[PDB]
mmCIF file of C-alpha atoms in Angstrom:
data_model
loop_
_atom_site.group_PDB
_atom_site.id
_atom_site.type_symbol
_atom_site.label_atom_id
_atom_site.label_comp_id
_atom_site.label_asym_id
_atom_site.label_seq_id
_atom_site.Cartn_x
_atom_site.Cartn_y
_atom_site.Cartn_z
ATOM 1 C CA UNK A 1 19.081 -11.834 31.712
ATOM 2 C CA UNK A 2 17.717 -11.886 28.155
ATOM 3 C CA UNK A 3 18.567 -8.932 25.915
ATOM 4 C CA UNK A 4 16.063 -6.178 25.107
ATOM 5 C CA UNK A 5 13.464 -6.452 22.348
ATOM 6 C CA UNK A 6 14.758 -6.361 18.765
ATOM 7 C CA UNK A 7 14.207 -3.599 16.232
ATOM 8 C CA UNK A 8 10.832 -2.949 14.645
ATOM 9 C CA UNK A 9 10.429 -4.750 11.333
ATOM 10 C CA UNK A 10 10.558 -2.998 7.995
ATOM 11 C CA UNK A 11 7.617 -1.033 6.722
ATOM 12 C CA UNK A 12 5.054 -2.976 4.724
ATOM 13 C CA UNK A 13 5.248 -2.442 0.967
ATOM 14 C CA UNK A 14 0.091 -0.561 -2.376
ATOM 15 C CA UNK A 15 -0.313 -0.957 -6.135
ATOM 16 C CA UNK A 16 -2.064 1.618 -8.286
ATOM 17 C CA UNK A 17 -8.091 0.341 -11.050
ATOM 18 C CA UNK A 18 -8.964 2.485 -14.074
ATOM 19 C CA UNK A 19 -11.681 5.042 -13.496
ATOM 20 C CA UNK A 20 -15.195 4.576 -14.852
ATOM 21 C CA UNK A 21 -15.885 5.221 -18.530
ATOM 22 C CA UNK A 22 -16.717 8.841 -19.323
ATOM 23 C CA UNK A 23 -20.201 10.082 -20.216
ATOM 24 C CA UNK A 24 -21.600 10.101 -23.755
ATOM 25 C CA UNK A 25 -20.700 13.109 -25.867
ATOM 26 C CA UNK A 26 -23.120 15.966 -26.369
ATOM 27 C CA UNK A 27 -26.491 15.412 -28.071
ATOM 28 C CA UNK A 28 -26.864 15.617 -31.676
ATOM 29 C CA UNK B 1 25.706 -9.976 31.275
ATOM 30 C CA UNK B 2 22.438 -9.260 29.487
ATOM 31 C CA UNK B 3 22.038 -10.971 26.133
ATOM 32 C CA UNK B 4 22.007 -9.200 22.781
ATOM 33 C CA UNK B 5 19.078 -7.320 21.314
ATOM 34 C CA UNK B 6 16.446 -9.619 19.812
ATOM 35 C CA UNK B 7 16.194 -10.131 16.071
ATOM 36 C CA UNK B 8 14.304 -7.635 13.887
ATOM 37 C CA UNK B 9 10.530 -7.996 13.736
ATOM 38 C CA UNK B 10 8.646 -9.055 10.618
ATOM 39 C CA UNK B 11 7.629 -6.612 7.856
ATOM 40 C CA UNK B 12 4.380 -4.732 8.288
ATOM 41 C CA UNK B 13 1.352 -5.854 6.296
ATOM 42 C CA UNK B 14 -0.450 -1.832 1.459
ATOM 43 C CA UNK B 15 -3.875 -2.035 -0.167
ATOM 44 C CA UNK B 16 -4.415 -1.153 -3.811
ATOM 45 C CA UNK B 17 -8.546 3.804 -5.461
ATOM 46 C CA UNK B 18 -10.196 3.560 -8.888
ATOM 47 C CA UNK B 19 -9.272 6.547 -11.031
ATOM 48 C CA UNK B 20 -11.661 9.362 -11.936
ATOM 49 C CA UNK B 21 -14.268 9.194 -14.689
ATOM 50 C CA UNK B 22 -12.970 9.316 -18.268
ATOM 51 C CA UNK B 23 -13.496 12.086 -20.785
ATOM 52 C CA UNK B 24 -16.785 12.702 -22.557
ATOM 53 C CA UNK B 25 -17.287 10.903 -25.857
ATOM 54 C CA UNK B 26 -17.518 12.643 -29.223
ATOM 55 C CA UNK B 27 -20.509 14.814 -30.161
ATOM 56 C CA UNK B 28 -23.573 13.162 -31.407
ATOM 57 C CA UNK C 1 27.700 -15.772 31.089
ATOM 58 C CA UNK C 2 25.879 -13.778 28.376
ATOM 59 C CA UNK C 3 22.132 -14.157 28.544
ATOM 60 C CA UNK C 4 19.697 -15.262 25.865
ATOM 61 C CA UNK C 5 18.722 -13.110 22.918
ATOM 62 C CA UNK C 6 16.000 -10.577 23.573
ATOM 63 C CA UNK C 7 12.491 -10.999 22.193
ATOM 64 C CA UNK C 8 11.908 -10.484 18.481
ATOM 65 C CA UNK C 9 11.056 -6.918 17.543
ATOM 66 C CA UNK C 10 7.517 -5.843 16.738
ATOM 67 C CA UNK C 11 6.021 -5.957 13.239
ATOM 68 C CA UNK C 12 6.872 -2.939 11.100
ATOM 69 C CA UNK C 13 4.271 -0.304 10.262
ATOM 70 C CA UNK C 14 2.036 -0.400 4.041
ATOM 71 C CA UNK C 15 0.269 2.636 2.569
ATOM 72 C CA UNK C 16 -2.574 2.464 0.100
ATOM 73 C CA UNK C 17 -2.173 5.563 -5.758
ATOM 74 C CA UNK C 18 -5.394 6.253 -7.577
ATOM 75 C CA UNK C 19 -5.812 4.616 -10.974
ATOM 76 C CA UNK C 20 -5.685 6.415 -14.300
ATOM 77 C CA UNK C 21 -8.673 8.230 -15.700
ATOM 78 C CA UNK C 22 -11.318 5.989 -17.258
ATOM 79 C CA UNK C 23 -11.798 5.411 -20.966
ATOM 80 C CA UNK C 24 -13.525 8.005 -23.164
ATOM 81 C CA UNK C 25 -17.332 7.772 -23.116
ATOM 82 C CA UNK C 26 -19.489 6.669 -26.012
ATOM 83 C CA UNK C 27 -20.702 8.769 -28.937
ATOM 84 C CA UNK C 28 -23.271 11.306 -28.054
#
């Protein structure tokens, strides 16, 4: 007969966008 | 006799969140 | 004699880090 199923493959490899700009500073 | 184990499977498929809002700007 | 190779293994299991903080905001 054929052998049994092979091993599971390796795990998939995710990269790190910048956050939104901050708010304006306090009112003058 | 039974054949050998099959070959390893393929690698799994990782997605890239945006960071948090930046700091407030300087006082007006 | 020895049988055929077993079936290929299944696909492996990738994980999704958050980006850096955004840029400073504009002048107030």
